[PDB]
Amino acid sequence: PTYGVGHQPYRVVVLSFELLHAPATVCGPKKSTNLVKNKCVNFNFNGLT
Amino acid sequence: VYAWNRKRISNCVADYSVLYNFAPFFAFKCYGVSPTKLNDLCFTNVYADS
Amino acid sequence: FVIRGNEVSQIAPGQTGNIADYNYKLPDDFTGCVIAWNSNKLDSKVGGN
């Protein structure tokens, strides 16, 4: 505890994120809606807008 | 700061990795070079202002 | 993991150093986040940990 600011311990957590190559198993709090076909619509498929 | 020290370092092998042990500073602030790449290239003169 | 405050900046893509060369090397193409916080109250011990 007598050390300086550069010699003090730091706890590090590194979150490495995979791409959408595999099934998107970790997905955030977004509520999915019903699918509408044959119409000019905006779409958000697993973060692909 | 109005009478800042200036020491010329020359004719020696410079190892910049011991500065972290010498001083409790958090990080460098290097402008023309990179602090990780300082152990490779050789300099003509180096001046330590303080 | 737990490191020193001098070597927090070594946890980055394309960087070299002691822990970045011998303990934990991040791929230069690392797509993710690094969260480092001070833990001088917990990890430090009086007389040395």
Ligand SMILES: *[C@@H]1O[C@H](CO)[C@@H](O)[C@H](O)[C@H]1NC(C)=O
């Ligand atoms: C600085 O010099 C003193 C003089 O004895 C020494 O004890 C100490 O280990 C040196 N290094 C640091 C980082 O204080």
